[PDB]
Amino acid sequence: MKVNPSVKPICDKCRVIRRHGRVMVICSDPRHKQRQG
Amino acid sequence: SRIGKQPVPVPSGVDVTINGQNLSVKGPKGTLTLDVAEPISVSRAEDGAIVVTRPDDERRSRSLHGLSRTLIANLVTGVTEGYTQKMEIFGVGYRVQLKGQNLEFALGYSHPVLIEAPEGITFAVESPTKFSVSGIDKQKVGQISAVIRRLRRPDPYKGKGVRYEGEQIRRKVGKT
Amino acid sequence: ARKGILGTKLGMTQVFDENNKVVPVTVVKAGPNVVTRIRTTERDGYSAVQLAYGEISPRKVIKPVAGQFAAAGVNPRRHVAELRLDDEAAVAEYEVGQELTAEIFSDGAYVDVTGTSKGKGFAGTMKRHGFRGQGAAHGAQAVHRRPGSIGGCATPGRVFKGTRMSGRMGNDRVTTQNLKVHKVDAENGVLLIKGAIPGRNGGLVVVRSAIKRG
């Protein structure tokens, strides 16, 4: 899971949310899990 | 929104009780109680429904509308038909048995593990590989099911562990 | 419940177990204690038992202490302490007047022994704090046993309360814990504990059950 200042939907199965004050991108692919920090 | 805009069916055998913003549902399987949100309104439509209505379209009430609607629906269905979860095991030597009302897992640890079914939940093994968990509460059944599910690390190589019934695990193979 | 008793440290010697291994023992006279008072939450705010040990002449007892013993109904003793209990069901079995001896303990029982350690006078940082000294040769000038630096320059500009310096040492409450009771001489009112006990000979110790190994 990346923790980077910029998170983007790498693939079309990814989708961006705000959970507990953080922008996250969540996909069915575990490699694409990614959040801001 | 639209889901929060339609009332919940109540069957001819299930009786409801409304007091203040609190309510309860009683049916063949058991009884349940629930509390309804503040800005939302809950009404007994005597023509056979419970109507959940938002006074306005502010985002808070717009949000709590469907939430409260689904809470009432889950309450009623849980008291009428109950909530059951089928859940399977995979691997050689990964086995399931019972002990009193508790359900015991032997999943390749150097010690056995066993889970005590908490209140309103009854475990029921139907095969050393296949077992089910049932209850009057949708949230409790799901939570204890998830607790069972995560007694092993995910296995993308052999798949061994506790899987749900209808779940298709992802699996990647190491080169050896 | 956490049992305990007051006694004196007689001395220490050695014994050989059945498997023929020498065991250093401190010998404690866990002589008779009368319980003189009960402390209860309903009245005092906590549950504890006040018990008295020793032999003392009534001529040497001050009138308030003699009166506090008369209200109990027991002859005065030299030392008075109390056991902190935990609940009221623990103090249900203590009644003002009754007795307790070394037979409260047994073989293999782990006990915590509280004593007061020996006085070491005004001690320096090497004895007191295990400081490394400084060189005995190679030019060291009159600093062979001194602490040296006690802070930093101008920031913070002070010496950080808690700095380890030299002063009075010893004479402190010390609890040595998980000490095995090798053997209770029941008839002679003695008990033999494997290990060392704080204090001088003929000093008051409190031998309690162990909480870590009970």
Next chain:
Amino acid sequence: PTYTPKAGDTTRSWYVIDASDVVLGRLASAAATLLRGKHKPTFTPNVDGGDFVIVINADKIAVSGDKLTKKFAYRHSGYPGGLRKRTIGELLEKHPTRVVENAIIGMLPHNKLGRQIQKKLKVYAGPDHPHAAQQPIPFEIKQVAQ
């Protein structure tokens, strides 16, 4: 000239303030007001001539926003690294009273007279107090319109 109190000029009144579902800052500011004596026309900044204040139900104080988890009370023990922090949350069920009184102490003057003034504050976490003998008249948190 201007009135200054003589020896037997100060009279003390006993106020009980209920703290159930009241804002902590509002309650503390009012209690500081009628603890210092700012409501008396005979006020004089030299003299400690306020009133006694009992705060009842200091448990039920209301703290707005999200301060029950991210607001802290810091103490320092004087030793290097001797700083400890307790949230408003922990402080409300460890022992609650000081929370309320903490606020009031921060709005009294930090001088010797403020130390004398503090002694008139009686905070109780329960709904009842032992001072029924002084007939404490209930006090309502009122605002004067303009």
Next chain:
RNA sequence: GAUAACCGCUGAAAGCAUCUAAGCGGGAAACCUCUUCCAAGACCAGGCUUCUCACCCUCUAGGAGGGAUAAGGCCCCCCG
């Protein structure tokens, strides 16, 4: 016990979906109890209890001042 990262449950807004938005959980040598020691000059100076619980004089009768005592202690003495 409460949590960090992390893992979730039930779930709208947004007919499907999502650990969150309403609510409910798991979660570390870090934090809070826990173990040890100091601790009421903690000025909110605490609690339980025992002992003594008395005897005169002056100034001018309002308060103060002086003195002899109790319970107790201190010094002197023999020591550690």
Next chain:
RNA sequence: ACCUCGAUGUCGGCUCGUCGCAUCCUGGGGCUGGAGCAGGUCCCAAGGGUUGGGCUGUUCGCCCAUUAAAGCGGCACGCGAGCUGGGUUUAGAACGUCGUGAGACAGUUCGGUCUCUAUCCGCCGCGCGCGUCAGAAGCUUGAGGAAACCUGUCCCUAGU
């Protein structure tokens, strides 16, 4: 070139620490081009721990035997009214080089005085006085603090 030239002592080592976390070990995880063993990377985590020698004035650094690991930093590049004095920076002498010379060299070599009875704050201990609405004594509650916290190997589980 802002304070200090009617004086703010300059490197390294010793003693004693103290704080940060930008984590070296130990603890919790997500992703792997992660089968296991062992890793890579990122995230959380500062409680404790973090060796002895050879070479060198050494810091740095090179190496030797270990270790769970041999972390990086701030504090007047912490610490000389606490130590040292190998380095550097007087005066002696010599080499090389420059200079006609006197002499000079971010060139080298050998030698070369490290003062102070602690006033105040600070800190480590120890008493005397008054206070806690009479005077005393025994036992105590604890708000609030301080201390401590490290870790390996072997064997069963399982040659699973």
